Design a protein around this ligand. Structure first.
Ligand SMILES: [Zn+2]
Lengths: 88, 52, 84, 50, 97, 52, 50, 133, 122
RNA sequence: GGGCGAGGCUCCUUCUGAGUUCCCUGGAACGGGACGCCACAGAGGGUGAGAGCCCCGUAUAGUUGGAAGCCAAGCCUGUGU
RNA sequence: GAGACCGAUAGCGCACAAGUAGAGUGAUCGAAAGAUGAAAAGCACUUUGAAAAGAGGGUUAAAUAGCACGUGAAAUUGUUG
RNA sequence: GUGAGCCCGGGUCGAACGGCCUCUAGUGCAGAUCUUGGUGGUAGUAGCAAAUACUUCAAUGAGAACUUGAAGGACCGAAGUGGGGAAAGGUUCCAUGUGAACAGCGGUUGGACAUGGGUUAGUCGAUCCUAAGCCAUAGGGAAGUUCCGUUUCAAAGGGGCAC
RNA sequence: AAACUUUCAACAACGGAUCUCUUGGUUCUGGCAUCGAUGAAGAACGCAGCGAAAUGCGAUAAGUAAUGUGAAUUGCAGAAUUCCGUGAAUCAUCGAAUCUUUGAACGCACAUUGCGCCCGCCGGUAUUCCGGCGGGCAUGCCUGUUCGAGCGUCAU
């Protein structure tokens, strides 16, 4: 009875949602995320899984601040207002 | 509840005797505010809110 | 909701003794009395002094907590420390 | 325009209706060649099924 | 003789950038010449004789002139590198030629 | 690309009675699972003698 | 369960708001390729994974 | 033959840029030639077309028709001309999209920005002619 | 109505800007109830008041920051939001004067023997 | 030792040549025939079918307006604590 | 910026709302899927049907292109000879 | 044409393609229990046979064994086929409407599909306490990711009085 | 003789091969140096008149300011634009801003929208009660300030 009848007793949870990465990988007894390694400071990644690295590498998300950096570099990180522009 | 009653008072001059709040399955909060017996909720809905 | 605890509100927050006032302001007693005289901080009397402090006697001096917090921002405290 | 929109909505369902999906939510992919049925050999000892 | 028993494919170096690197070097030389004009783009080098018995028949350019050579030619060792003369303090003069 | 046809985890099901011994993509819930991999005769696999 | 946390109830609220078909005005747009909701969810078919 | 290294003769890049150009670029792309009278009047060969211009169709099955530009539909790169329409099955009218390169502008919709455009194009043309002459 | 131009806002000072912000917020709050009670052309108006509130807040913030920069024009320490952003590495980079400081022996050598301008005859 | 500095370089911005002439097929000429024109531009793309001259661009010298740096022929000066 | 490369079972796993849908407690695994037409002009109206639809009649240069849509092979099937 | 093949005619079709000489290769298939996809005979076949059971009238509807109302007959038989919860699910709850698909027969019905609505607390829980146990700090190991350590070889803090 | 089975042909099916296409890959070459406690990469939740996704954005939420262009956006609805203009746009540029809950994540925690502390401001009869808002409170280390401990060494 290791199959169909034993599958009926599965109503607990080993993993919950992790606050850092959003996956259901936070082990509920060890309080450690199996994916990102929370609450360790460094995000968990390994070089034997290039797929796992590419699933969470920079650019797979929003680039909320980092996408505006090349334009500011191209303009030389200038500060101020265009000459004669309306304002205060 | 305190924020809701303060907002109602400073919006529409509404005095409430109690407020019950729930959070709906869509994720927004719904608030039932019972008014003082001196003021008429039907009159408030007709004039201030336009709920006819 | 959550049950309040005894002695965490009321006259216990409204008043403090001279000992608690000098410990709050980190002042010596002459400097505290001098600053109270200069700023007009007056002694007070609670209705029940045991509600403020269980060791209070008839000779215990009480002040307002808001008066002590107003004294906490006086520039003369810096002058006292500079002179020391 | 409402008739054309409803016709477009009904014509969008023809592939899933031929696939007999119960709505657009039925996207489940069934195992057509399971490993437990298409791998291994049956020995004289313990078996994987009766 | 030739063997490939290591993982040789990870470190194969091809040279399709040879004409591009020649173009880059020539552009850098033109920029350096324009910056250094009207001075020459290179420094004056002494004539030195190659070591060992195989190459002692031939002379070539060395690193820089010795302090004895600069003093005998009348050029101070602080003025010499400022007018395009290379100076080498390690080399000595073992003969007068 | 030097990774073409080799970015999969697949293993042969072994000698049996039903299917050929090509390595097959593991897992479930998708069309790719159970399909062949890594062969030049396989769809979505590495070709014979990749060009360098 | 009836006993649930605020985080779980918020995720269920977002799922309930996402569970809808596409508007019919989408299919009449110029160069439209969307024909149905390809990410539609049903309670009996697939799980939220919470 | 192109010489400048910033110019690309790639067909894929050209088609991607053309079909993903934004609205201000599509305005320049949707240019129309001027008539002979307007050309000898303003010394300008071409100008971007805008709503309110008066055009004559010189190519297609609607050739020699004349009308006012009622819409510049930059999304499918077409213009709508008044009375150059067809009938739907129902009997209602529906406009026929014309490419601006298949029309010629006979009367310009004039305002101070249009005069600025024409003046600077004419000034550049005469400056170029004087320099190369 | 309800579409306040920024050119009008750039001349006002603080109190009437706050008054305009208050009246726009009040009319927006009323017209949301009008939206939920009936359908009409008031949706364009609620969009206009949302953008007008955004413009008024932008003008107020810009004038506040300009006044604060004028106040902190001649002071050694500025607030972190008023300090130039650049990048973290650029902020931690040495200043131009500290990068151009040389030793006094080096100063003497560069004073009395700099790089000369020379040419060689052919 | 200081201070000017003509001029040059780097970067964005305005502008650039010539047929929609006639005939046939065609739903549509961007095809075929004829007569031309431009070219330091006959790269590429779009336009109802293979378009140098319909449109964007393309080639070359330049030409408008602006910002910030660098190089620099020369010129004023103090002179030795 | 380019190519004596590949042309949708190829080329990156992905030319498409692709590291998506989906599977697994989990680490992880991981697809399929492009093309009406120049222009929707995506069939008015009549008629038979409960409707889907059909038949007339239309649009188109073509419906032998009808949102199952360029071309439309073979296996395999129906009718007719 | 010995042959691999080449060329033409008729039909379909709609935007490119070929001959010759050199150059180049991811270049020629019946097999690999080959890969992917598609399709046959079997075959209108095996089968749709546990849980005692259905019948009459009327209404609805194009269409009713499995929709509804009434009329009968039965079953669960209080360790229930009843009334409520914990885990788990997440809107499946309720009203209205419904073409296709799904409900291995039908379907007007539906946990399906479409549009909306619904969950109101000082007193019920969580929140508080500690259990088994886990994680910080002091400090000590470890190349290091980190491990031990949880009262220690820690300056680890509370109160009152004062002319 | 028909039916059935098989073969041949035409048309119609089934299926998606072939041909042509390509806003896509792959490989090479050239140029550039620019993430984060002034809060990054990543995660979650929201924002459009009518959107689930993709895209864009953050309660100023398919966006604000500024500069430039100069008449659109479009699937519908509704408004435009004094067109001789502080001016459309799902426009471009982009120097000013806004930037929810998180995350190295910083009051303590977090399987809790849990529990605190310090200082101001405002409102409700309020010296005490109640509520809201704003600014703060991690660790190691460096320089300096100030308050200190020790017969550790001295002077007196
Ligand atoms: Zn995690």
């Amino acid at each position: 009875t290791k199959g169909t009848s034993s599958f009926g007793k599965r109503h607990n949870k080993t993993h919950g949602l992790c606050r850092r990465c959003g996956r259901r990988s936070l082990h509920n007894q060890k309080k450690v995320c199996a994916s990102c390694g929370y609450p360790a400071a460094k995000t968990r990644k390994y070089n034997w899984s290039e797929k796992a690295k590419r699933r969470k590498v920079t650019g797979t998300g929003r680039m909320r601040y980092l996408s505006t950096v090349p334009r500011r570099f191209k303009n030389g990180f200038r500060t101020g207002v265009p000459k004669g522009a309306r304002g205060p | 509840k305190a924020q809701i009653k303060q907002a109602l008072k400073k919006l529409y001059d509404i005095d409430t005797v109690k407020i019950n709040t729930l959070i709906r399955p869509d994720g927004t909060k719904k608030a039932f505010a019972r008014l003082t017996p001196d003021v008429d909720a039907l009159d408030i809905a007709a004039t201030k809110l336009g709920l006819v | 909701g959550k049950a309040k605890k005894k002695g965490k509100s009321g006259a216990a927050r409204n008043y403090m003794t001279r000992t608690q006032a000098v410990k709050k302001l980190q002042l010596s007693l002459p400097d505290f009395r001098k600053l109270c005289i200069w700023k007009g901080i007056y002694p007070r009397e609670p209705r029940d002094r045991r509600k403020v402090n269980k060791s209070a006697t008839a000779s215990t001096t009480f002040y307002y907590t808001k008066d002590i917090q107003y004294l906490l921002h006086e520039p003369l405290l810096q002058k006292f420390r500079e002179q020391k | 325009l409402r008739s054309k929109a409803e016709r477009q909505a009904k014509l969008a369902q023809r592939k899933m209706n031929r696939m007999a999906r119960q709505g657009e939510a039925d996207r489940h992919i069934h195992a057509s060649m399971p490993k437990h049925l298409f791998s291994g050999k049956r020995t004289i000892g313990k078996t994987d099924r009766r | 003789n030739n063997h490939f028993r290591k993982h040789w494919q990870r470190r194969v170096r091809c040279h399709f950038d040879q004409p591009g690197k020649k173009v880059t070097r020539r552009l850098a030389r033109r920029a350096k010449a324009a910056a250094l004009a009207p001075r020459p783009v290179d420094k004056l080098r002494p004539i030195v004789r190659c070591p060992t018995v195989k190459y002692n028949r031939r002379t070539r350019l060395g690193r820089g002139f010795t302090l004895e050579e600069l003093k005998a030619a009348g050029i101070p060792r602080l003025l010499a590198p400022t007018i395009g003369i290379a100076v080498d303090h390690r080399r000595k003069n073992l003969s007068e030629e | 690309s030097e990774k073409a046809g080799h970015q999969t985890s697949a293993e042969s099901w072994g000698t049996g009675r039903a299917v050929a011994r090509i390595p097959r993509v593991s897992g479930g819930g998708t069309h790719r699972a159970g399909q062949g991999a890594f062969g030049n005769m396989c769809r979505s696999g590495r070709m014979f003698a990749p060009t360098k | 369960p009836s006993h649930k946390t605020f985080r779980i109830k918020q995720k269920l609220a977002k799922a309930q708001k996402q569970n809808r078909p596409i508007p019919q005005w989408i299919r009449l747009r110029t160069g439209n390729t969307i024909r149905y909701n390809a990410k539609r969810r049903h309670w009996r078919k697939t799980r939220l994974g919470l | 033959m192109k010489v400048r290294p910033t110019v690309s003769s790639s067909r894929r890049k050209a088609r991607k840029a053309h079909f993903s150009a934004p609205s201000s670029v599509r305005r320049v792309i949707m240019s129309a030639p001027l008539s002979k009278e307007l050309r000898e009047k303003y010394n300008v060969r071409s100008i971007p077309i805008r709503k309110g211009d008066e055009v004559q169709i010189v190519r297609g099955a609607h050739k020699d028709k004349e009308g006012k530009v009622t819409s510049v539909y930059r999304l499918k790169y077409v213009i709508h001309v008044e009375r150059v329409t067809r009938e739907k099955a129902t009997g209602q009218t529906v406009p026929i999209g014309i490419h601006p390169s298949n029309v010629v502008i006979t009367k310009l919709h004039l305002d101070k920005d249009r005069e600025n455009i024409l003046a600077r194009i004419k000034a550049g043309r005469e400056q170029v002619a004087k320099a190369k002459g | 109505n309800g579409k306040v131009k920024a050119g009008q806002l750039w001349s006002k000072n603080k109190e009437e800007l706050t008054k305009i912000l208050g009246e726009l917020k009040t009319e927006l709050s009323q017209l949301r109830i009008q939206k939920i009670s009936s359908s009409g052309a008031k949706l364009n108006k609620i969009h206009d008041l949302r953008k007008s509130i955004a413009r008024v807040l932008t003008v107020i913030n810009a004038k506040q920051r300009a006044q604060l920069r004028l106040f902190y024009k001649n002071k050694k320490y500025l607030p972190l939001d008023l300090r130039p952003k650049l990048t973290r590495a650029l902020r931690r980079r040495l200043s131009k004067e500290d990068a151009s400081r040389v030793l006094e022996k080096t100063k003497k050598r560069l004073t009395h023997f700099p790089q000369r301008k020379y040419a060689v005859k052919a």
